[PDB]
Design a protein around this ligand. Structure first.
Ligand SMILES: Cc1ncc(COP(=O)(O)O)c(/C=N/NC(=O)[C@@H]([NH3+])Cc2c[nH]c3ccccc23)c1O
Ligand SMILES: Cc1ncc(COP(=O)(O)O)c(/C=N/NC(=O)[C@@H]([NH3+])Cc2c[nH]c3ccccc23)c1O
Ligand SMILES: [Mg+2]
Ligand SMILES: [Mg+2]
Lengths: 422, 420
């Protein structure tokens, strides 16, 4: 056991944090001691306080923390079978989860490859695309194309398709310009012309549909995805959708691809898949992709993580997916978006604010200058909210269980850090 | 809910398995329905059968399945806090685990970066090495060197240091390290490293045991040589202990057989006792401080589920359970049982070698082992074995009794007998 003071001492000496230093941290981490529902208990000045998890712990906690149905699914599975190797063995949690994911994802995605993290699932999707074209006798189709503004994880291949300026740029991939928010057919015509020149060396287009999360919380018209589907079909390039942040209702559709009625050839999901309990991700592909890989000289997808298809993670994901589908989740997200829109409207008039935008249960204030976390974090904590701004963005992706009142507290805190920026 | 028959139906239609095809698998998976201690319950011909998990579920289940101390650590943490983002927050399970890992790993490893899988932890170690030399103003030091026979995961950078014969970055490979110590091999490794030193960020190897690449063992004195070569030529040394850690080779970490400390080390697999995916990359203070003072100012990596409290809490319990008992005597007794039980295999006509290292036992055969013959032969004897290439091997849970070890080795000998 450790007191909060001892936690901070160990942390400062021995723990790396995301995109951080050791011993140069201008702001040291805050100790979290409990989480329940939409609330985190954090230690502030040696006193525990409850604050709203406005970020859903980086998009994961869609049902909140410690939801009784998800806890019970985990403890039920734990009593039976914690984990067995997926080499030569299968089990009921993987089968239940695979069946669910195939039924609820865009039509045509009928096979499921489980992995342990989103970045790995993106690498599996790339491996699938590359082995597909090798199986078609076109091994020159080796590169990936994307548009700027994206984020796909931190492994070396995933990094090669992240926005180059938001990754300090590895494989040299093809980047189209930033897709705009409002639909401009000239953008799609130019994307096509750029892809056409590279078609013979391109295995896939990879994009985040409708919402680009970690790269800038930018939204784009779903009609762009119909254009990509059509360009990819006409030029013999696969289409991969990275729905690791957008899946499971977040943008108001079950998957963002559903806003456009398009099906990619390959899709990645993660994050909210387990309700934020455990790391799990999945890469889905069409029957054609699967059969082409399996019929190639290679004969098999050469990927297999040790903890593939972990029964505990699958069991809680089954419960999390069923809990979502068993409720009127579509109405719940619409009400969340309306609450975010009403709460963030005051921000439109603030002098440091450039844009306010909402899409499903995602709210964003974009500012004209970086927001200083040394100012933003205490301002938000004083208002009972945990917010984590980055670059010039103050944003929220709240749990689906937040009441109207909790949304008022979250948006009030966002507007106030925006007011403090100017 | 699904019966076993329905599980097999869904599985065959919708689930990819490791290193497999869809619809072309000559062998379909067996349904597992329970696991307790060293035993799995599998469905065979519609009936449940108990079999020993001789593989510890791919090296992870060192305390067996459903151990009460690990079950309870997980449920205790579940009642408090499932998960919080590690960006701007810290918590007691991560701190308790980092404190443990720093104290039990080779000396000088003082900082801990948690990730969700072994493959990712290997890429973090490569990122640490590359950012280290950039922080020293030597960004030409960009490549990795290893010896043949290795395996480090399936992500694209990890694949680049896998044995090429068993789109990728072009790394530097020394020949297969032999089992017996030969100073000529170390001299040749040194001569090859010397030619590339100005472009090498790190040497990366699995110490003492190379697992997935062939279950090959090598004399620990080679690691003393690598440490000295790396120190003299200013190349970082990275040990991948994802399979060898936590007592498996008879020492707590295989590097301890040599008394060597690398600059960077990866651990995983048995870290959680086989409950949950977790991995960690450790580095010295000097590596950490050089990266933090570099133009970057930070290690540019950070997975969503970094330092997951549930995974950390169960790992803390697994490590403390291992340290709280006389694990060294346990592993010596397990190794003695494997040696005694596998001795009969040496004289079999298809067997090329029998070798044991700690709680690892290997029969190397003169032909690839046919899983369609080996798997029922092993199940008929109450043992789950998963051969690969020409190897029949076991890495059993540390809780196996002498009789269970004898049952495992008797089953291994019998599949080896069937190969010829
Ligand atoms: C030292 C080290 N470094 C990194 C990693 C990656 O770690 P991760 O999987 O991403 O968590 C590992 C993972 N080893 N995994 C296995 O041995 C199993 N797949 C069994 C396995 C080994 N040969 C095989 C051949 C065919 C089928 C299964 C297997 C590691 O041993
Ligand atoms: C669509 C999609 N695809 C793949 C992955 C990889 O997923 P994984 O992390 O390997 O499981 C994710 C992960 N998003 N992660 C987060 O939002 C933050 N933790 C990262 C994060 C927080 N500040 C940052 C500043 C700069 C860059 C990244 C970050 C994803 O959104
Ligand atoms: Mg379908
Ligand atoms: Mg490898």
């Amino acid at each position: 056991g450790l007191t909060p003071e001892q936690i901070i001492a160990v942390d400062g000496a021995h723990l790396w944090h995301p995109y951080s230093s050791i011993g140069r941290e201008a702001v040291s981490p805050v100790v979290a001691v409990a989480a329940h529902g939409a609330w985190l208990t954090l230690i502030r000045d040696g006193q525990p306080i409850e604050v709203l998890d406005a970020m859903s712990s980086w998009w994961t906690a869609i049902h909140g923390h410690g939801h009784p149905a998800l806890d019970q699914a985990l403890t039920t599975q734990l009593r039976v079978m914690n984990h067995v190797m997926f080499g030569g063995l299968t089990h009921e949690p993987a089968a239940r989860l695979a069946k669910l994911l195939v039924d609820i994802t865009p039509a045509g995605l009928d096979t499921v490859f489980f992995s342990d993290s989103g970045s790995v699932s993106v690498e599996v999707a790339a491996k699938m695309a590359l082995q597909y074209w090798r199986g078609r006798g076109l091994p020159g189709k080796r590169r990936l194309m994307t548009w700027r503004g994206g984020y796909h994880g931190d492994t070396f291949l995933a990094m090669s398709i992240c926005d180059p300026h938001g990754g300090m740029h590895l494989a040299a991939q093809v980047f189209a310009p930033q897709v705009p928010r409002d639909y401009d057919p000239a953008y799609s015509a130019a994307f096509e012309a750029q892809l056409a020149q590279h078609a013979g060396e391109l295995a896939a287009v990879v994009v985040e549909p409708v919402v680009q999360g970690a790269g800038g919380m930018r939204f784009h018209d779903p009609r762009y995805l119909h254009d990509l589907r059509d360009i990819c079909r006409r030029y013999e390039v696969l289409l991969i959708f990275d729905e690791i942040a957008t899946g499971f209702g977040r943008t108001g559709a079950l998957f963002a691809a559903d806003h456009a009625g398009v099906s990619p050839d390959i899709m990645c999901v993660g994050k909210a898949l387990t309700g934020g309990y455990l790391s799990l991700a999945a890469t889905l592909c069409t029957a054609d992709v699967a059969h082409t890989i399996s019929a190639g000289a290679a004969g098999a997808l050469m990927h297999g993580p040790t903890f593939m298809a972990n029964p505990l993670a699958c069991a809680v994901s089954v419960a999390s997916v069923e809990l979502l589908l068993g409720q009127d989740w579509r109405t719940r997200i619409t009400e969340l978006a309306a609450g975010l829109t009403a709460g963030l409207d005051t921000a439109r008039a603030l002098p440091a604010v450039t844009d306010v935008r909402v899409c499903g249960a995602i709210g964003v204030i974009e500012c004209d200058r970086p927001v200083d976390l040394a100012v933003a974090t205490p301002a938000a904590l004083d208002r009972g909210v945990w917010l984590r701004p980055f670059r010039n963005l103050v944003y929220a992706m709240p749990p689906y269980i937040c009441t109207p009142a909790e949304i008022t507290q979250i948006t009030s805190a966002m507007v106030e850090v925006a007011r403090l920026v100017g």
